[PDB]
Amino acid sequence: XXXXXXXXXXXXXXXXXXXXXXXXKXXX
Amino acid sequence: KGVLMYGPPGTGKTLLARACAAQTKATFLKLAGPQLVQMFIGDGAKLVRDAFALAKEKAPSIIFIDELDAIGTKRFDSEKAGDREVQRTMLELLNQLDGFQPNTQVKVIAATNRVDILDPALLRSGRLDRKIEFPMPNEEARARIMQIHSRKMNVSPDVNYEELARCTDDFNGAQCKAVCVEAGMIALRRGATELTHEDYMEGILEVQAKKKANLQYYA
Amino acid sequence: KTYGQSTYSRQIKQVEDDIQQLLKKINELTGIKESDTGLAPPALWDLAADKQTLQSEQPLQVARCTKIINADSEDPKYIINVKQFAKFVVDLSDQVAPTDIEEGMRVGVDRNKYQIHIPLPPKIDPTVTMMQVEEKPDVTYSDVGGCKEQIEKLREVVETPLLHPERFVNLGIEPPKGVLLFGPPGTGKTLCARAVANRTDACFIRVIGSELVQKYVGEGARMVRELFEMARTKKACLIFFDEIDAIGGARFDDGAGGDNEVQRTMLELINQLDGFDPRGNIKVLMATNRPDTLDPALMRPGRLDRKIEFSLPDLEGRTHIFKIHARSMSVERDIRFELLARLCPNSTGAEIRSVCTEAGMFAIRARRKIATEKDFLEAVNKVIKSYAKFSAT
Amino acid sequence: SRRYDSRTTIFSPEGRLYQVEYAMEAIGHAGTCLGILANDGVLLAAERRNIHKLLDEVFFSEKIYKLNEDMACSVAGITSDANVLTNELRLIAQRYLLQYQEPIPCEQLVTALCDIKQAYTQFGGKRPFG
Amino acid sequence: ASKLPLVTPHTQCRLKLLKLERIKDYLLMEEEFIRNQEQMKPLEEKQEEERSKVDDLRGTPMSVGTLEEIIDDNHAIVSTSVGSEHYVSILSFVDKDLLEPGCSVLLNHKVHAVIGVLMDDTDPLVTVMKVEKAPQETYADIGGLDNQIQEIKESVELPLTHPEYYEEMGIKPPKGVILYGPPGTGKTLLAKAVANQTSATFLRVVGSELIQKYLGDGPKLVRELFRVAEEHAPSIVFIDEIDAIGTKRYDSNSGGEREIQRTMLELLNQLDGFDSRGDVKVIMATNRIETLDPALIRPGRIDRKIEFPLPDEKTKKRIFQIHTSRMTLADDVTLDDLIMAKDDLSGADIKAICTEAGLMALRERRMKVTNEDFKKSKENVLYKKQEGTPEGLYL
Amino acid sequence: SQLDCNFLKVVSSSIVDKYIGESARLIREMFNYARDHQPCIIFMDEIDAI
Numbered sequence A: 001x002x003x004x005x006x007x008x009x010x011x012x013x014x015x016x017x018x019x020x021x022x023x024x025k026x027x028x
Numbered sequence B: 001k002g003v004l005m006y007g008p009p010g011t012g013k014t015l016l017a018r019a020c021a022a023q024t025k026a027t028f029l030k031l032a033g034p035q036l037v038q039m040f041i042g043d044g045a046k047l048v049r050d051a052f053a054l055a056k057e058k059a060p061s062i063i064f065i066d067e068l069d070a071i072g073t074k075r076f077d078s079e080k081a082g083d084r085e086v087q088r089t090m091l092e093l094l095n096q097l098d099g100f101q102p103n104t105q106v107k108v109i110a111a112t113n114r115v116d117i118l119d120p121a122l123l124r125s126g127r128l129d130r131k132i133e134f135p136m137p138n139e140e141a142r143a144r145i146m147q148i149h150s151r152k153m154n155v156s157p158d159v160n161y162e163e164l165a166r167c168t169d170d171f172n173g174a175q176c177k178a179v180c181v182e183a184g185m186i187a188l189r190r191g192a193t194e195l196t197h198e199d200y201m202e203g204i205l206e207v208q209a210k211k212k213a214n215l216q217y218y219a
Numbered sequence C: 001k002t003y004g005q006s007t008y009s010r011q012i013k014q015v016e017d018d019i020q021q022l023l024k025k026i027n028e029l030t031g032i033k034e035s036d037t038g039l040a041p042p043a044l045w046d047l048a049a050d051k052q053t054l055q056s057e058q059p060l061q062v063a064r065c066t067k068i069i070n071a072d073s074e075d076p077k078y079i080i081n082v083k084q085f086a087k088f089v090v091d092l093s094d095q096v097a098p099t100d101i102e103e104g105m106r107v108g109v110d111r112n113k114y115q116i117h118i119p120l121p122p123k124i125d126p127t128v129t130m131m132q133v134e135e136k137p138d139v140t141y142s143d144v145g146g147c148k149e150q151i152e153k154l155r156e157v158v159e160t161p162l163l164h165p166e167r168f169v170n171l172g173i174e175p176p177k178g179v180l181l182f183g184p185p186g187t188g189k190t191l192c193a194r195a196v197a198n199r200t201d202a203c204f205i206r207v208i209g210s211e212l213v214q215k216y217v218g219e220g221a222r223m224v225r226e227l228f229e230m231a232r233t234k235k236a237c238l239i240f241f242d243e244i245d246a247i248g249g250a251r252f253d254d255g256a257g258g259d260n261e262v263q264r265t266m267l268e269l270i271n272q273l274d275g276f277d278p279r280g281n282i283k284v285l286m287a288t289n290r291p292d293t294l295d296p297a298l299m300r301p302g303r304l305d306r307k308i309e310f311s312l313p314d315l316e317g318r319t320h321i322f323k324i325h326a327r328s329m330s331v332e333r334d335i336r337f338e339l340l341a342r343l344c345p346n347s348t349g350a351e352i353r354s355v356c357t358e359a360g361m362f363a364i365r366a367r368r369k370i371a372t373e374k375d376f377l378e379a380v381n382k383v384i385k386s387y388a389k390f391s392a393t
Numbered sequence D: 001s002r003r004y005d006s007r008t009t010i011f012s013p014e015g016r017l018y019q020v021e022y023a024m025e026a027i028g029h030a031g032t033c034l035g036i037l038a039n040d041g042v043l044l045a046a047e048r049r050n051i052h053k054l055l056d057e058v059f060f061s062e063k064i065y066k067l068n069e070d071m072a073c074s075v076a077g078i079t080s081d082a083n084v085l086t087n088e089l090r091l092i093a094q095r096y097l098l099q100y101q102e103p104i105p106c107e108q109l110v111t112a113l114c115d116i117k118q119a120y121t122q123f124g125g126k127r128p129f130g
Numbered sequence E: 001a002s003k004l005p006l007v008t009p010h011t012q013c014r015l016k017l018l019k020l021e022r023i024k025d026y027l028l029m030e031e032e033f034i035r036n037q038e039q040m041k042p043l044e045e046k047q048e049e050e051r052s053k054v055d056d057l058r059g060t061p062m063s064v065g066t067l068e069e070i071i072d073d074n075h076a077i078v079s080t081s082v083g084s085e086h087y088v089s090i091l092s093f094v095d096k097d098l099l100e101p102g103c104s105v106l107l108n109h110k111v112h113a114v115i116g117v118l119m120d121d122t123d124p125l126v127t128v129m130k131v132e133k134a135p136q137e138t139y140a141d142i143g144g145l146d147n148q149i150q151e152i153k154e155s156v157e158l159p160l161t162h163p164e165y166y167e168e169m170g171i172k173p174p175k176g177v178i179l180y181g182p183p184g185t186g187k188t189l190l191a192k193a194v195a196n197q198t199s200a201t202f203l204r205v206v207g208s209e210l211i212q213k214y215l216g217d218g219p220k221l222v223r224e225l226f227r228v229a230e231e232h233a234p235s236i237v238f239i240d241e242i243d244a245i246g247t248k249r250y251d252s253n254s255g256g257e258r259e260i261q262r263t264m265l266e267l268l269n270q271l272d273g274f275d276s277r278g279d280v281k282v283i284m285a286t287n288r289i290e291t292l293d294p295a296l297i298r299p300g301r302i303d304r305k306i307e308f309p310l311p312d313e314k315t316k317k318r319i320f321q322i323h324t325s326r327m328t329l330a331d332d333v334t335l336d337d338l339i340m341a342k343d344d345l346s347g348a349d350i351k352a353i354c355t356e357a358g359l360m361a362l363r364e365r366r367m368k369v370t371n372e373d374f375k376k377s378k379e380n381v382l383y384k385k386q387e388g389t390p391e392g393l394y395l
Numbered sequence F: 001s002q003l004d005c006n007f008l009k010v011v012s013s014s015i016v017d018k019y020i021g022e023s024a025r026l027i028r029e030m031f032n033y034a035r036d037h038q039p040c041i042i043f044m045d046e047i048d049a050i
Ligand SMILES: Nc1ncnc2c1ncn2[C@@H]1O[C@H](COP(=O)(O)OP(=O)(O)OP(=O)(O)O)[C@@H](O)[C@H]1O
Pocket: B008, B009, B010, B011, B012, B013, B014, B015, B113, B145, B148, B172, B173, B174, B177, C270, C275, C297, C300, C302
């Protein structure tokens, strides 16, 4: 009877992937 | 450490806040009461602490807080929510103002309407040092205020403010401003340029808002 | 079985009925493509489908939207989050000018090299979009007859500075930026609200008073911020409140464990109304039925200046409201209304219009084409007897 | 001074009484009695509400209160609210005998009590008899 | 579809007879022109050629997004399943007309452009509150009102079924109707009877279920109720039992009762403040009428107030008949043993009798009907009333 | 002011967060930091929040 409330958060997860055939030099 | 304004709600408290911010050149920082109340939990303790860290980086700095009664409340046996975040942000305000790790590079001005809600922890002597009441304008201040707001308007120079201040009974600075505003438009109704004593007396009849009639069985 | 109501009754009907059936039977005969789980009908995209869609494929981009935190010196060097992807330090592309890229702005950023292309309008949540009225009802000032004093006071305040900012300059005053309206119900509060929203020349913004009470704390305050932020952008806008008793009337503290969240919301309305950096060009109208149990912080002038009341007029407003409501209907030319108004001394304009709508029912209690004065006599015969032995009265 | 009054005198907004109806529902609980006559003689039935096995029962008389040489009564309600009424009604029957030297008829004795019980409902805000 | 908007004669005027036969001519000739397309060049130009141009234009995997806002004509902002938002342009293949915010879309891979729309489901709130079908008995159930039937018919049904008389004089129908009287009269019956024989949608609302232990949800349920009722159809909103939820400002207290005040204050504005709702029929039912807030009672909100009395010996003879119309009846019973005697008891009491006689017979495993069934059932329904009565002797 | 190296102070109000865990996760890290340095002092003013 007439009572407020606060809240909360449930953050999702995250993930990434690639073909992984890229070289990272290009320097020299 | 800290200056508190309090009084009746029309005596002028936002004035000296805006006035001294107008005159000084330090980093003036505003803050309202219900801005510290947020939806999720935390978020005032985040908000108060980030507010003072901004005041440290700009070391000549003054923080003004208005409607401190919205967050300053004498705690008791409270259930559910509502208060169960408000006192949490209030304690963060107490700690980040005074006590552990003191500072001298920030000054706090607060102003309420009602005093008796507040904690003794807010009022202690080191959180808010000076306590400044604002009384209602007694006689001559009512004559003084109505002269101030009569600056721009075309006043016929046969007007005694002491006659006005004696008949403006129990007004505040907001109502004495309102009588000066209404008396200009009443002269605009009939197209007169200057004013009269009758113009102010009719403005007093409008601000007091006399409702009805047939009150004639007196005298 | 039945009878003709007017002469060729079915003869015009089935001529209309089968051609609406035939407008269907055109389309399936031509071949119609409907209900194809969310597409367009084929008659207008077959000449859209080809290479001026490839003009939207290859020249156009995706342009992922973002948000700006701050700027830097001598150069843009903008710090920007996406929303939940990563915060970046990025630059504008050359198609913009570095002027309207101010902070706290939703902007669109290229997906490949992360550069700014388009500034976007800010996030206005729809709950306050649905209270901007965006249309204006047809209510004339003449329709609120019987209120010659009350409209004239309200003309002076809401209307005249917004349409003549001249006389107030030439005398040197400030208009009374807020007006309260009150009185007994059914008297014309909402009429004057619609009639000013008619001739507004402004961004009229409706507010229902009980839309602020919510379940969570502080979110009811966050509405009031977004109102006065759009108010400072939409220059010279009007805001109408209605039934402000729900927004808050008292500060009950004897047993301070009752209502608090409405008090916090009501205090937020106090600060953004007056105090610390005034609002400029915003006028506020309020309307309640009991203007007695309100907080005197609202009653301070500067906030609520004029207390206009709405009474039951005398004897001649009723004759004029008769001439407002019973101009617009189909009656006999033998009208008189001083006879009618003297029979109902204490009545609202709602009770006036209730009689005029009751009067049309008697002609439909009968089988007539018209409204007779004697029928309207018999209309005012019953409603005197109806209001004498009414249930609530 | 004025906010502590209970207002047990005003009618109900329905247009009836408001406090007496609360009182009459206490009689239905805590007691059950009856009496039957059709010829020469009359009986009274009582019921022990508290029948615990550590009472004395040395009164040798009970709810039947012999108030006269020709009359008695059977009471149900608040217990010591009756002891005010039984001592009062016993003396009304006795001051009648002082006045006339003739025993009191059973009709007008009942009218003497019912004028007393009404008088607390008429005026004062005194708590009525349950 | 929206072929011609004119209806303005609205009668047997010759103007409509001319206009609609023009519309008959422009439609026949458009048909007879296009009939001679599949006669002389009967080509199938866009069976798959329209489709295979576009199914190859869109990607083969489709991805469902969500609308957030709509900007000028082609580019709008969307939201992916995780929250990444894209400022993509829509094509002229999707129905732009049913494209409102809060809807699922179909997207692309490279440019993520809006390709199509997925149709919506049915909201649960209709399935909660709407009496979905014609529930119960028709006007063969009611016992002889014939004037109360006449008022509700010309206020709701005859406006809805045959709107032609109001638009002759231009006079709008009255809006609100209050049903009131002593309890057990047939207030729920008359709502369901009109809900039986109707053509528009009907909504039943129990008023006691509008009090949440949270707060703000009082006005939240109200502002969604008329929102659904407006957006759905021609609608008739019935709210039973408003007497113990919306009475008046009796003490102006706080702590819950102030919340109940705010719910009725929203309902008062949601009933009638702004932009007259249109094709919304409001019917309200109470037991008590006196302790009601007069701001609801005023015209502009409710215009019809109908008393419900109790007949004594006349309509009961059918109410006793209708409740005994589907049961046995041995010849030892006369309904005039009970109809002629007492003159105040409700129609709900009559149903309470006519079920209890069926209870008393089959409990004792007997045959059809005795008189003593109706004797003991009438005696019981007396105690069903009287045992909750504190009345003594003349108050 | 004696130690000035081995003293932990907590306001006992900035512990709360917007997530579901993440307030315990501070407390586990605190005592584990108090586990690593051996003579530690914990100070939490104004428990009444937490
Ligand atoms: N002593 C005064 N001298 C001149 N003007 C005054 C005085 N007191 C009030 N005013 C007028 O009152 C207005 C500001 O109101 P005020 O400062 O009383 O609000 P407050 O008391 O700070 O806040 P609240 O109204 O919420 O209590 C100004 O426009 C100012 O002109």
